[PDB]
Amino acid sequence: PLESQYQVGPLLGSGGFGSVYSGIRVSDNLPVAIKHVEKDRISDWGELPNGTRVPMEVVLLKKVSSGFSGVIRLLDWFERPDSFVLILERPEPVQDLFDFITERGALQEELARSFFWQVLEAVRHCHNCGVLHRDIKDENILIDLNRGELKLIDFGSGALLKDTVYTDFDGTRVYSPPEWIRYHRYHGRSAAVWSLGILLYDMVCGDIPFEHDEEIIRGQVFFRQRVSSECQHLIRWCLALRPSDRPTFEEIQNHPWMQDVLLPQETAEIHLH
Numbered sequence: 012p013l014e015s016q017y018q019v020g021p022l023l024g025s026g027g028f029g030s031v032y033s034g035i036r037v038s039d040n041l042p043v044a045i046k047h048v049e050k051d052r053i054s055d056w057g058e059l060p061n062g063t064r065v066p067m068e069v070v071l072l073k074k075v076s077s078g079f080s081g082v083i084r085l086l087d088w089f090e091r092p093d094s095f096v097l098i099l100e101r102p103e104p105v106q107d108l109f110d111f112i113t114e115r116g117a118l119q120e121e122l123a124r125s126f127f128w129q130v131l132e133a134v135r136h137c138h139n140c141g142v143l144h145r146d147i148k149d150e151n152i153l154i155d156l157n158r159g160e161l162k163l164i165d166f167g168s169g170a171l172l173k174d175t176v177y178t179d180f181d182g183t184r185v186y187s188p189p190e191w192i193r194y195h196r197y198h199g200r201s202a203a204v205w206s207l208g209i210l211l212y213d214m215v216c217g218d219i220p221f222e223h224d225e226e227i228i229r230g231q232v233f234f235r236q237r238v239s240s241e242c243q244h245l246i247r248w249c250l251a252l253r254p255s256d257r258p259t260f261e262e263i264q265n266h267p268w269m270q271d272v273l274l275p276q277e278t279a280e281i282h283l284h
């Protein structure tokens with residue numbers, strides 16, 4: 012009984028893959044997010060420990076659910092005749108990176124460092140759990156304004172992590188790597204690092220670097236905003252044309268610009284309060 016436990020609220024947003032509403036767990040007033048996904052649009056299905064057919068999204072979210080709240084947590088889920096309904100945790104107040112950057116424009120490096128670092132910890136968490144996000148971007152990152160913690164959301168274009176090549180992709184095009192645009196082939200980690208490269212640029216310049224396929228395959232990076240030399244370096248490194256030339260997650264976090272990151276709470280007190 013879904014409608015009995017939760018109290019549906021306002022429409023937080025929707026797209027090709029879902030409609031999301033703001034609900035509250037009638038049980039304890041817990042704030043949650045209710046995501047509706049139509050069975051038709053669902054492309055990938057999995058099963059997880061049970062042998063129960065469910066959309067890959069549910070599989071992935073279950074594999075990454077844990078104490079670590081660097082990634083959104085699935086509280087429960089229900090299946091319906093023509094759709095699946097997911098109950099996600101919902102922080103409040105909260106704002107997504109896209110809206111936040113859309114209001115403050117380019118972010119101070121110090122803040123971008125904290126945020127970027129947090130995203131990296133989350134993505135590492137996922138890979139570690141055998142999950143590849145495939146759609147890392149400002150829109151899929153939530154900001155818990157009080158604790159200054161970011162959360163990865165929307166594993167709708169995700170997939171189990173593997174070492175062999177990927178031939179499918181349904182994530183955001185402007186965040187996809189050169190190798191996808193050209194050969195429609197890519198490898199998880201390297202493809203991820205490339206989008207992390209687009210994300211960082213996005214944070215420090217206030218907008219993405221590439222808009223057209225040509226710009227992506229060319230990979231020439233121009234900075235529209237004053238950006239430190241160190242940050243520019245890490246950015247160009249993540250956006251290297253050749254996949255194998257991109258940094259490992261370990262190399263990114265050991266990069267000079269990534270040092271002395273602020274604690275989440277400090278970040279909130281200085282940049283969010």
Ligand SMILES: N#Cc1c(-c2ccccc2)cc(-c2cc(Br)ccc2O)[nH]c1=O
Nearest residue numbers: 024025029031044083099100101164165
């Ligand atoms: N797709 C998607 C998704 C969202 C979305 C983003 C932009 C526009 C419309 C919907 C939001 C969420 C989402 C939002 C909150 Br406050 C809390 C938990 C969530 O899990 N999940 C998605 O999986």
